[PDB]
Structure formats: C-alpha cells, structure tokens
Design a protein around this nucleic acid. Structure first.
Ligand SMILES: [Mg+2]
Ligand SMILES: [Mg+2]
Ligand SMILES: [Mg+2]
Ligand SMILES: [Mg+2]
Ligand SMILES: [Mg+2]
Ligand SMILES: [Mg+2]
Ligand SMILES: [Mg+2]
Ligand SMILES: [Mg+2]
Ligand SMILES: [Mg+2]
Ligand SMILES: [Mg+2]
Ligand SMILES: [Zn+2]
Lengths: 67, 41, 48, 138, 157, 154, 98, 79
RNA sequence: GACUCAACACGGGGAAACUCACUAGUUUAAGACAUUGGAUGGUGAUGCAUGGCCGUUUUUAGUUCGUGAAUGAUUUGUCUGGUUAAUUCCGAUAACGAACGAGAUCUUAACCUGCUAAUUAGCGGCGAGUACACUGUACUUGCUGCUUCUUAGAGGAACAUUGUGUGUCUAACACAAGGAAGUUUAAGGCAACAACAGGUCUGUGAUGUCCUUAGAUGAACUAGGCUGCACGCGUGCUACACUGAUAUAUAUAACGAGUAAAAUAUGCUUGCAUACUUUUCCUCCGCCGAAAGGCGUAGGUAAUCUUUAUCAAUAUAUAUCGUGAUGGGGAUAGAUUAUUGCAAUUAUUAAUCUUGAACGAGGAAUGCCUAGUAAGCAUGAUUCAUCAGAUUGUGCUGACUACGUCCCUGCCCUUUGUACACA
C-alpha cells in the first residue's frame, strides 16, 4: 500500500500550482484535484487526493523536500 | 471378538456394556421400559 | 460410399477441413485452434 | 403500514414484508414453527427474543425466500427480520425505541443488520476448486 | 427462424470469412475496410451469402517479395510510421532470413505499451507470413496510435 | 415432542401451518382406517426408483407416498407425473462410478394419482397442465390438518 | 421494439436517441428495459499442441438485448427508427396491438 | 463419376459468362452447385482446367474456391 | 507426438465404423496443362529449415535508453540501509532524467443511489371464489400506483479517512473506531526485455527442401487394431463403516444449454417414381412400461416453454441395522429388457435379477491448500448418433492452522572463487 511515482509526481505538481485552493479536508482536496488534473479513474483520483492531503499535512509542520 | 446375544440410568451403549447385548435389543428393552440417539431415566 | 452423416468424420472445420477438435457449440464448427486466432473478429473478447 | 427490506447470506435473499397486524410471522406460505431443522430454529427466532414478543403483536411479517441452501437461507431470513423490524421502527414508531433496538442487536451480534459479504470464488483451471490445484508426480 | 445467440455467432463467422477473402484477394491494396473491378467482388459476396497496421504489414510483405536488403526496408517503414504521427512503433521479422538457422530481428522506434487494456485499445497489430526463397519470413507489425487519453498521464494545468 | 414456547400465534388453518412428516403419518393412518385406497398387485414386490436397489421396508409405504403426493399437489398449482418423480428422487450409487441423481419409478406414482382421481381427490384440469387437487379433496386435507393441529395442542 | 446488439455503449446511445425521438410528440414510450445478457462463453484450451500446463481461456461474447414499447402507427415508428444507424445494432419493430 | 456431359459443360460455361465469377465449394461429395444442379465435382474439374490455361484466376479462401474470369477466358466464351 | 519441474484423463485424444495416421486386402482418378514433360495430394520425412500460436524461465520484478562520469569488453545509473505485493517508494549518492515491465487500465463479485427504467421479472391494486380464524390467514381463476427484492445501464463509495502506536517520527507499517468493505476490498484478465536449438509442419490451402504420384505413403470401401498383458510409474473414482449404510419423509442451489433425414398417400414392379407435410435439439404433459424406455401429443428459435417462488446431492427428521469382511464394500462374473446407431462381439451405455473379490485408514516417498477458501456434496456445459469416473464452469454444506521464517526445496540479489561459456 504505497504510491507510485506517477501518483507522487502528480501530488508534487499540485501544491506547486494549487496550494492556494487546498486545506486539510479530504473531500475538498479531491474536488480540487478533479477540477485541475485529468485523472481518468475514480480510485486513482481518490488515491491522488489522499496523497495530496498527506503532503499538505507534512507541510505546515515543516519543509517537505520538494515544491 | 465379542459375539453379543439376543435371547436371554438408561442409554443403549450402557445397556450394551452391562448385559452384553446387541443394540437393537437394547433399543427394544428401552421401549419396553418406556411402555435416533437415546436418553432415559 | 458409406454413411458420412453422424460421427466425427461426418463434418469438419469450416476453416481447414480438420475432423479433430471442432467447437461444435452454437454451430460455430471451427476447430479450436483456428477459433482461438479468429476469436477477435467473431467478437469473443477475453474478460475473465 | 407496510415495509419491505431484504436479508442476504451467500446467494439467498429473504425479503421481509413487515406490516401492521396481530403478530404471526411467516415464510412464503408457512409459519416460522417449521423453518426446517429443529437445531437451527433458534437463529431465526433470536432477533424476536432480543426485541421481545410483545413488541411484535402490532406487527405482522411475511418473508419470501429464494436461492441458496438451508443454513444460508436461515441466515438470510434472520437478516431480513433484523433489518425489517428496525426499518419499521425508524418510519412508523419512535426513534428512541429504534435506537434501543439497534443497540440491543449490536450487543447480541453483527449479521442481523449488516450483511455477510462473502461469496463463492471462481474455480481456476489446473484444479477442482478456487485454490486447490491438481497433482505433480515428477 | 434462427435464435439470437446462433445468429450472432453466424454473423461473426461471416465477418471473419469476408476478412479472409479480402486478404486473399487484395495483396496489391492498403486493406482495412470491412463495410458493405469491385463488381466481381460483389458478385462473389452475393454467391457466398444469398497509420493502420494491416496496411503497413502488407506493404512490408510486398517489399520482401520484391527483394530488398530487409533492414533498410524496415527502417523506411519505421520512418513512414513516424511521419504518419505514431507515438510509437515496433516491427519484428523472424524466420529463415539470410542464414539457415533462426534469427528474429526487432525494430522499435517510439515507446510501445504492451500490458493492460490500454494495449488492447491503443495499439493496432498485424501479422503476415511472407513466403520467400526456402520457407517463410514472419512479419509482425505493432503500431501505437495517437491517444482517447492514456491512464498513466496526470496532466496538471 | 414438537411443542415449545414461541414468540407468536399460529393461524392453524391450512396444511402449510402443520409439521409435515407427522401430518403424512396421520393421513396414512386415516387411509388405513378407511380402506379407501388399495395396494394394487405389483406394489408388494416393486422398487420405488432406480437408485434404491432395495424394497421400501415400511409395509404401508404406498399410503405414505399417496399422502405425500396430496401435500405436493396442495403446495403447487398443476403438477405432473414427471415432476412427482423428480420430487421423489435420490442418489444412485453406481458402485464404483460416482453417484448420480436418480429419477423415481413413475408407474406407481401414476397409479396412485389415478386412484385418487377415481376417489375424487385430484383433478386433471383441461386448462393449464397436469392434475392438481380437486376442491373437495383440498377441503378434506385442510380439515385433517386442523384435526392434527388440535390433537397436537391437546 | 427489440434492439439486439453486441456493443453496449453503442446500444445505449441508440436507445437514448430513440427516447429523444419519442419525446417529440404522440408517443406513450415505456422506458428502455435491458434484458438478461445471455453471454456466449467458449472455454478453449490454448496451445495447438498438448505441451505446457494446459491453460484454458474463457472467451465471452456478451450479447445485449434491449427492449422498448409504444402505442402508435407503423409509418411514425419507422420514421422514429430512422436515426440513420449502422451495421452493429440489430433492430426489430413489432407492430402488434397485442 | 468421370462422365462430363457436353450439354452440361456448355450450360456451366454460359452460367459463368452470365456471372463473371464462380464460387465452387471445394467439396468432393456435395451433389449440386447452389444455383445450377450439376455434379459439383465436374464443375470443380472444369474450373481447374480453366485455371490451367489461365482463362480463369483463382484465390482460395476457406472451404470455397472463388474463381474469377480472365479476359482471354471471356474471349473464349464468345464461341 | 510429448520424458524432471516445463511428457504421463496431455494433443480438447470419452477411437465400435468414419475418426485413422496402423494391419489384412479391395477399388478408384479427385493424373490439371503441352504414352512423354509437368504439376497436384499427403494425419509422409524433418519442429535441428521456418511461420504463427502456446508454453515455461515468470507472474517474479525485471529490461532498456539519452546525456554525463569511470584503452577495452564494460560499469555506473538500476545502491549501504529502511520500506513495498512490486528497480514500490524514501534516503544516501558520479549521476540526473526518461521509457517498457510493475502500478494504473479492463472484467467480474462486494455495498448505495430507497435518483434511471418495467417486459418475456416481480410487488402490490382489485374482482371472483374455496377452506378456516376474529368481531384476518392459507389457496387458485379474471382484469390492470410501486421498483425493496428481479433484470442492468450510468453514477456514488475507502483515501489507510478520523483515533493511537512503531518508523531516520522519511517512505511506510500495526492496532482501534467508523463503515458494505481496511491484506492495491476479493478474484481474475492483460503481460516488457531476452531466450530455451521446449512443443506443434498429426490445426491449417501458414511452409521450405527430400520422398511418394495408378501394384500412390493421394482419396474411397470392407473388416481388424489403438482398449491386446508376467509387470513398473502417473491423474483420478470407489471404499474400508455407526459423525455410518439401509429405507421412508422433509428441506432447500447457481452457472447453464436447448431446431442431406423421416411420415403419409398415389402409380407400377421388398424396390423405385410421384405428391405432400409434420418430425432432426430441450422435453412439459397424458397414457403404456417393475425398470430402463416407448407411444401420443404441448410449448419453446427463448427472463415467455423445457424450468428455475426450484432441475441436485450433502443436509435434517423418523424407522431397520449393531460392530460381526457385517445389510460396510460392489470388484469379477453369469444370464435379459431396452436405447443409440448401417453395425454393439473384444460385452457403447442403460435397466432388472443374481455373483459378495480386494480393502479393518495404507510402507519408502510425495502433492494441494490461509476464508466462503481445504474437504465433502452434487450439478451445468465441453466432447455427444450413444457413452464421465475427464476437463471446465457453477453453486450447496463451511473446518483445522498460520498471520511467520529462511530449516529444507526452488527462484532472485550483493559479495567471493572459477581452468565453465555446449556455461
Ligand atoms: Mg505499464
Ligand atoms: Mg466409447
Ligand atoms: Mg478404425
Ligand atoms: Mg523448437
Ligand atoms: Mg547496470
Ligand atoms: Mg498490471
Ligand atoms: Mg489411445
Ligand atoms: Mg478427457
Ligand atoms: Mg515440493
Ligand atoms: Mg571455453
Ligand atoms: Zn481448422
């Protein structure tokens, strides 16, 4: 249950561009992702959202090492 | 071997143990007393 | 000539006239190897 | 008035129509007196026992079962009953009572409200069963 | 009167037959088609009844028949494919080929996805067996087309 | 034996609200008392179906069978001989080759049905399909069931 | 009206189109009812030969039968049917009072 | 059988001319061709003969034979 | 043909003939085209000539490039470590960045929309009754808002979310709550690179060469054989009983699959010709038949009929046995009655009667398996004129034990050694 580079890459791409839109709320994040990026799946999209959320959590408490 | 006979706290196994008998005979005895597994007192 | 109407040698593959291993369900009448190749064109997709 | 929910164990959908009435409770055309084997009878009666026999004197119940074997059917019936009574309570009786009933059910066990999600896994070639392969002698 | 299942299978079979017939006939053509000089063809069908990969394969076969240096031909084909806007290609030629024993030769250009339903969708594949000097040369061409979007990409704006 | 503390009342009206085997037994007994149905000729040395490889061992099995058939008829709308046969099927051990399902000997069933119709319990309906219960017969069956229920209660 | 076909999405599209056509006027159209998809499964053994741990492959040609009703005159229904359409979706109109 | 009536042959030729093509069915013991009731073997033989001279051109698909008539063949058929 | 895994119920190979390649023989031209040249056919020879397809290496995680760096093959990247189902990530770093493979995708199965739809599905609605209850319940004929169940399209839902641990508090893991679901939810499908001198020319009119070509190794017909049996090794089935056989009764599945030959009349010598119409597959049902089956008819080219609000067996309940090769066990045998087929013997299969063998739980070895799984129990389909003990699906009854480890076995990795590279 770990994320591939594609997911990770996507997450990285988001938070660079759309950090403004995002807040520590999963549904909102997912919505934002949907609005922005072209994920064809549902499950994959969800995963991406989750990772974005995680990334966000990691920031505010420190530097991420990326973005 | 144990060739049990026919002509001469209740359960069939017990009966078999006690008087050395076929369990059909035990069943019969039980029935008589009363008058697919069994329990009687 | 001897009765060639009901038996394995009666009928054959449509495709290559082989009397062995004919898919005889739904009147397809193709020997299974041939069917395996033409399963795409006939509209037989492997899902599960 | 009248409420229709289902149970579900394996395949075996028991559809419980719970209506206003005198308190009989039935299966297709037969009383729950029967079900089939005397041993399993308790698995159908259990929700009723939990909730109380007086609470169901307002509620008639019919149950239509279809598919599955014996034990599975029984389970389905049970599930239907559990969902059914609670559903009825949620609509036409009070909420507090419904909540109480739910709590009681939870204390007893799962399976009454929420369903058993298991189902027969596809057999795979090179074997008879799902996992069970044939045999190599070398 | 014939049942639905039976009908469908029959139709499929007919389609296959038609395809085979076309293949047999049109060695000189960029064949794909299957939707119904040509008069004869029509007559035949009546009697019976009462960018693309296949084309490329055919071309390759024709070239082989003509008698080229093989590798060069393959390269040319690849170039053509590239020109026609393909994201990736692959050609294989296995068979006798110069030597007696063995010798499968790959010819890839752009990237070629192999696994998944994307492969099934976004590649056209084709297989011809060009008969030659002392046996058969075995073409297989595989083209990855322009996508309607791949599952791997996540395009952030 | 059967009775117990239940959480509902039982509308003991039709045979579907009665325990089966007991009911069947009762019906058989009633039949015996009447002498309403015979025991043909071949009955006393026939085998009920391919799979049984052995005679019944019940003496008045015919009566029991008849009773069962009645119940079956009551249960279903229109029921044939084939259906009946299927219903009274068992596993046939083919010795060494594995078991198959075995269709019952239909002749006896047919005979029983005929007897019933003669007596006026079953009815070959010209609409629909093969032989259902006749209304009088059904009523009688219901009555019997009721009686049985009463007895059980007692 | 019975619409038999092999391709799901196409069939669905066709159904939608016919619904749209109906909604124009004069048509008491019952909604599209998709029927039980009676899937033709062939389990062929892969490999021409008998070599290799005999892998089978379950093909499935899954036919979608679709069904739709109307209370109308023949010409009108014919017109409705004319959405152009193509060789893929097999149509059949029933013009019975019963 | 190896009879080959002349009239039958002529009829076959006429049919071919009318069509331009003949779908033979490469079957030994099938009695008749779909349209004309001729022993199929004879027809097959005739088509083979034609092919040999290059009066007809053949492109063999599965089961069927699919014969198409050449210009020389057409000319010959003029008779 | 195939010979360790990766041949041995495998070639869809359950062959009475056909299949048929084989044996004993007998026919035939299916000898095109200019007795001659010359093709045509081959279940002939060769898979070590090849095509395609399939297998295994391997469903594991692996393969490769661009540039850079380090005479050359090459190496690096692609790694001490942590983590992952995974060259899955993190972190370190002469690399940084890609691409295929993994992951994603596809197909099911899992739970919702009490939104989309209502037959060939139901539920009610309600007439009409037949039985019995109290002051409604069970059951059929006749007529026609709801979509929970029944079908199946589009959507939704889990992301380790919230809670708490362990972890470089990195990638991530463990537990708890919520929840239909917390091992990418379960199961498949797909399948990189490179091979193996793996298999298949007995799948092919994919196909080379060599052979054969009328006293044919072509095709066609008549038998016979693939099933022959001191024996060795496979895959299975059935058993060895009492948690059981026996026999009655009761209960209840899911996936399915289902359409040249015969009948009757006319005309002539059992045969032909002519006319005309149901039958060729699933069998309802009604009669005959112990049984098998038969005859008559009925629906079905199928959510309508077979038949599916029940087609099965384990189940369960009540009887007979009573541990005794026993009624466990049904081998082997003997004799009929059918059905299929032109044809049943070397017995097709089926039924009926009888025959009552080995086996008292299995030695050396070795296989399969972690949750609807093992096992048991059946059953649909594939072959099929007929015939499952096979395969392949589907369900029904529903365990034990882990929840890890490298001890064996097999793969993979780094280091190391090599005189091996056919490794
Ligand atoms: Mg990929
Ligand atoms: Mg046989
Ligand atoms: Mg033979
Ligand atoms: Mg090889
Ligand atoms: Mg390297
Ligand atoms: Mg994948
Ligand atoms: Mg053999
Ligand atoms: Mg087999
Ligand atoms: Mg081992
Ligand atoms: Mg060396
Ligand atoms: Zn073939």
């Amino acid at each position: 249950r770990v994320r591939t580079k594609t997911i990770k890459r996507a997450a990285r791409q988001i938070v660079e561009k759309y950090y403004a839109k995002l807040t520590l709320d999963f549904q909102i994040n997912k919505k934002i992702t949907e609005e922005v990026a072209i994920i064809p799946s549902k499950r994959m999209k969800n995963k991406v959202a989750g990772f974005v959320t995680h990334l966000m959590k990691r920031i505010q408490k420190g530097p991420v090492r990326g973005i | 071997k144990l060739n049990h006979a026919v002509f001469i706290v209740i359960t069939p196994s017990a009966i078999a143990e006690k008087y050395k008998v076929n369990l059909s005979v035990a069943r019969a005895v039980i029935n008589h007393l009363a008058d697919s597994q069994k329990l009687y007192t | 000539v001897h009765p060639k109407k009901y038996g394995q040698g009666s009928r054959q593959c449509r495709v290559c006239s082989n009397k062995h291993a004919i898919i005889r369900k739904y009147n397809i009448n193709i020997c299974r190897q041939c069917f395996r190749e033409r399963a795409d064109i006939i509209g037989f997709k492997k899902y599960r | 008035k009248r409420v229709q929910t289902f149970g579900k164990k394996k395949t075996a959908v028991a559809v419980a129509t719970v209506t206003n009435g005198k308190g009989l409770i039935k299966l297709n055309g037969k009383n729950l007196d029967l079900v089939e084997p005397y041993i399993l009878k308790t698995k159908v009666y259990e929700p009723l026992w939990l909730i109380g026999s007086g609470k169901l004197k307002n509620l008639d119940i019919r149950i239509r079962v279809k598919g599955g074997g014996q034990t599975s059917q029984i389970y389905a019936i049970r599930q239907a009953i559990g969902k059914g009574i609670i559903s009825y309570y949620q609509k036409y009786v009070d909420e507090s009572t419904k909540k109480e009933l739910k709590d009681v059910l939870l204390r007893y066990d799962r399976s009454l409200l929420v369903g058993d999600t298991r189902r027969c896994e596809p057999k795979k070639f090179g074997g008879k069963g799902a996992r069970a392969r044939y045999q190599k002698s070398y | 009167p014939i049942s639905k299942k039976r009908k469908f299978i029959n139709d499929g079979v007919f389609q296959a037959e038609l395809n085979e017939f076309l293949a047999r006939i049109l060695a000189e053509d960029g064949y794909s088609g299957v939707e119904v000089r040509i008069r004869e063809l029509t007559s035949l069908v009546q009697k019976r009844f009462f960018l693309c990969a296949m084309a490329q394969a055919e071309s390759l076969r024709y070239k082989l028949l003509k008698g080229l240096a093989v590798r060069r031909a393959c390269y040319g084909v690849l170039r053509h494919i590239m020109e026609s806007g393909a994201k990736g290609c692959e050609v294989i030629v296995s068979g006798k080929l110069r030597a007696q024993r063995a010798k499968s030769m790959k010819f890839r250009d752009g990237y070629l996805i192999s696994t998944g339903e994307p492969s099934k969708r976004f590649v056209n594949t084709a297989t011809r067996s060009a008969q030659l000097k002392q046996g058969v040369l075995g073409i297989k061409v595989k083209i990855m087309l322009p996508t309607s979007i791949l599952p791997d990409n996540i395009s952030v704006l | 034996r059967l009775l117990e503390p239940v959480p509902f009342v039982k509308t003991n009206n039709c045979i579907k609200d009665v325990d089966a085997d007991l009911f069947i037994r009762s019906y058989a007994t009633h039949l015996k008392l009447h002498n309403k149905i015979t025991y043909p000729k071949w009955c006393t040395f026939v085998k009920t179906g391919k799979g049984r490889k052995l005679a019944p061992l019940n003496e008045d099995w015919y009566f029991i069978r008849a009773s069962s058939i009645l119940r079956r008829l009551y249960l279903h709308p229109d029921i044939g001989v084939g259906f009946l046969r299927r219903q009274f099927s068992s596993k046939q051990r083919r010795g060494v080759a594995p078991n198959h399902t075995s269709l019952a000997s239909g002749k006896i069933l047919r005979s029983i049905l005929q007897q019933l119709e003669n007596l006026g319990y079953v009815e070959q309906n010209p609409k629909k399909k093969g032989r259902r219960l006749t209304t009088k017969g059904e009523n009688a069956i219901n009555n019997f069931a009721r009686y049985i229920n009463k007895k059980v209660y007692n | 009206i019975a619409l038999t076909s092999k391709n799901l999405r196409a069939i669905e599209k066709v159904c939608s189109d016919i619904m749209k056509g109906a909604k124009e006027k004069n048509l008491n159209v019952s909604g599209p009812v998709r029927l039980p998809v009676k899937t033709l499964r062939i389990t062929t053994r892969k490999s021409p030969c008998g070599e290799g741990t005999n892998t089978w492959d379950r093909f499935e040609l899954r036919i979608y039968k679709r069904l739709i009703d109307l209370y109308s005159q023949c010409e009108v229904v014919t017109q409705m049917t004319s959405i152009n359409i193509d060789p893929v979706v097999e149509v059949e109109v029933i013009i019975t009072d019963s | 059988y190896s009879y080959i009536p002349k009239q039958n042959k002529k009829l076959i030729y006429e049919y071919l001319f009318k069509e331009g093509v003949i779908v033979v069915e490469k079957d030994a013991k099938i009695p008749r061709h779909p349209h004309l009731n001729v022993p199929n073997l004879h027809i097959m033989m005739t088509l083979k003969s034609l092919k040999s001279r290059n009066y007809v051109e053949e492109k063999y698909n599965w089961k069927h034979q699919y014969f198409i008539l050449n210009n020389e063949g057409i000319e010959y058929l003029r008779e």
